[model samples]
Target: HQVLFQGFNWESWKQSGGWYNMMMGKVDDIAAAGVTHVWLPPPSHSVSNEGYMPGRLYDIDASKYGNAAELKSLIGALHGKGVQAIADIVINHRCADYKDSRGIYCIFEGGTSDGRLDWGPHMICRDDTKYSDGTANLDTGADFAAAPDIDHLNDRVQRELKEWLLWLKSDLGFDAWRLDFARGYSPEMAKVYIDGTSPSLAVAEVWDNMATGGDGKPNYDQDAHRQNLVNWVDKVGGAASAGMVFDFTTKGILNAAVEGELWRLIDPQGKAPGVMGWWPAKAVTFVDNHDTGSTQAMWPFPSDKVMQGYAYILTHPGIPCIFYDHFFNWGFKDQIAALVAIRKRNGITATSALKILMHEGDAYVAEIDGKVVVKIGSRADVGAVIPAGFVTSAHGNDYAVWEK
Candidate 1:
């Protein structure tokens, strides 16, 4: 219904209808859900309708999402409705489709605009030319042939990207950015660009934590994930800025726990350890996302316990990002909306202290002091809080979130 992914609309009206146009019809519904920012898919033209293999930076108005005027219209409407839109950055690599895909081979003419930057270029990866840059980028864990990896160290590439970012901000009215791949190049190199010209906000996708722990845990040594987050926020931004990273550790640990380890969440410190326990401000907490919730999505949380996951995120310290499917398709929006209202009315934030009141296999209760209280799982055990009057009973659904 939102962005294109597997089963996104191949058989639905989305294939033939004006999807982005229709989205403009429901700006109010999204706002009512308390979404302040919308992370739009890549706005440039791409080889695939899915918008991942961007073909031209200069083709600002073309993509799987929509064309130029429609994109501008969508941005205008969302802005008037009080929701700022952020553009997706594919710095990992931009494409040049060619005879089939090499369909759009773009030449980097370099420069700001005006007959320029209709632009895309190679970073000397898989190329057999003598690049003039002092340093280089090579294939390793960070580089490959999916698309040529750009060298952040190249002065030309770096300068052009900085200019492109400026153009994207002013030309397209983008308030912030969401970097697609934090590991595609040097982490420090990413910091170079982001810290140098960071916008109001910049969240990176550094997904890593997945394997189980040696002691039979799901996400062992989340510190590695936590450090990548630290590299972006503390190591890079320091005192002036704070970059954010997704809580893969939370997704890993929480998903497994929900299946059969529910009682493990009763730890005095937290439900599980990850970026949340260490750097709450830099952690974007979530239970599921477009990747894990699609019809054929990967690593999905148990469908039954999704609400319990929401309760935990809403009551904890990390900034929460709700998935589009959960909020609209699966009939959980209203339930989560109540939670959003509670979060907004109370000053619940990342700095709030977390307390684990109880967490059993079938019931969980957690509180954030005067800000709010959240309980999920079975209504039989702690669900009695409604009758006890300690937890507000006026509203809430599968999971209850209310004033204490």
Candidate 2:
């Protein structure tokens, strides 16, 4: 299994930084650096507002970024150079185009009571019960407000998704999909849609702990939510059937470890210990993603020398994924190359063996195959710490690797 390098918040590429050509230029650079897969932000049309306002699925509004053809070309270019592309699919909801009274496609002209545009008949509003406030009751499961939730229970919606997915596979040649807000839809409905389409790989963004509705109050259980999502996926479509959850628990642990916070590393095992036990290879592990926040913001450690972080993730027991900015901005090509070589030489399959050899205070020492050990803590010296009879190479203050 190879490491996955993901680009953060790329949907705003055109407006913010214009998809820096250097970012595109890093695809081959990352591949050469030992990364085999790359994950990109939601490529579908989105709400044209600040802070993630939802939008139409197929519209491709000129404000956000390039159209479908440009995205297809980008993926094709990556594949041409032997790198896999995993696209983020936002099927959970569509943005309500309030400016256009008739909606973007003229599907809802008279203003929807529920505000949900029915895509079947080309976007008609669904009429449902209203809240006491009478402001088009959104929570009644009728509309998603600024981003109206699509009725996955609707057969037409499923059909449209199937068609689009097939196009992504056969026409555009996409490798995988990261289902946005997958928990919003019923598991049965999601299973039917995913089974019908059958993309090479599929992951759902079912945030369990981020639950904001219940008894007219807001609440959250970060750990519980994570567990529920993992279980729900297994219940609907066997764990192996769907790909993997985006291991947010591990991400938290990595963040804590980087910050030298000893307490955070206490339960570094994450919610699904079974995941590491069974489908470890399938799990998509990363230091940071687009939505939550960047690693730089969370950790107090130095951001310039990130090789140490990469060494731990790459050698540890899960499919390692790299954030685009972390790689290019930090110049991690050489470290990545070395990590990949170690995996290739040792056949150090992820999820196989992540034995914690030592965990004292902020310092951690662990081995993946009884051969490679990763230590991250406050050690006074700055040199190699290879086990007995192994060749070693040190890269800055981040980390060092040893091989027999």
Candidate 3:
């Protein structure tokens, strides 16, 4: 039932006037949009300046977004609005601070003499070809080529990561985690961190490519893609793990549906397609993110059809994530807010029962929990078919929602 807001875009670090202050000014707006949680940029010091290639895990002052003081203020401001903060945690790989005698970037800097967060070459995976002096344990997951992948099997590594997570939770007031590069480590390790931190929420960024055909587009069937997500969650201890994953399956299929394939919105099983169709509670649905949109534009949804995208995700079952660019930068705030209002007013939620009412070449319609009905498509009069008891609540470009 919770809605997430991606508080920054990929290039937010380049904000001329400063990023954290700008976020501070928008706390009221974020609360007005009904965002339960705001996902912030990585807060640690990194070699790349964007907080992704992290070097010093505890040095928040060197981030390009803002200083440590500014970040603390921004997080406090968000909490003041009753919104929780989700920190981008990159523990799969770390950018080393110094090279060893063999010139391998294996030496690290952080933590204290107490052996909580201090890490060195011994923490890096032995199979990491870039490092000659890493531990004897191979990486438990995929290797990140840009830096030395941490060996999750190493007890010291696990202990240090757990302590850092506790610091982010208790010391810094982070309510949740956006586990970055989750594909670079095992899901079991992710579960360990989540259990130790006990955050309000934990979403993994297990991103990978879906199956594609000769047309250079995703295939109509994405069961394999969604199964990977299910597998990850199951491996992480299922519901007990308290872990969720971003629904790239829904993002991919939804974008394709809006691009003249509206019929693709429903699967052969007659359900709403993608991960949301199978496991709505665990699916964190989003249209785009830092990598897929903004300056990246890697796999962006259709620009003009964005409201259609929002219309579907916001009204349907799943934890919907609103992107910063689409909400603040692209001038869709009012329309999106209206949908959010309708969603909240009608009590649509992650576990709401959904039934496909119509699925045509140019339109798709569905009712949620028998209380909210939505139509999204190219047809102008798609709203004409609103059932007898339904009343229009919100409408926009190629989209409409009703309360019954």
lDDT of 1 by residue, 83-155 (tens): 7777777777655443223433444433224644433444544442232132354522265356656666666
**Which model scores highest in TM-score?**
3
Q: lDDT score, residue 170, model 3?
A: 72
TM-score of each: 0.83, 0.77, 0.97
Report the alpha-carbon TM-score of model 1 versus the true structure: 0.83
What's the lDDT of the predicted structure labeled candidate 3?
0.86
Better of 1 and 2 by TM-score: 1
Model 3 TM-score on a 0 to 1 scale: 0.97
**Candidate 2 accuracy as TM-score:** 0.77
Ranked by lDDT, the better of candidates 2 and 3 is: 3
lDDT of 2 by residue, 1-404 (tens): 66677765534454444452334656677777766776766554554432244354444333244555666666777887888887777665555444344233323211224432334322222332211112221231224444455556555666767876676667666787787666666666667767887766676655443334556222322345456656756765875465466665555445445555433343445322323433565566666556554532532224543565677667777677777656655566566777777876677766557666555565666667877766666664323334577656444564566656
Query: On a 0 to 100 scale, what is the lDDT of residue 347 in model 1?
Result: 71
RMSD of 3: 1.5
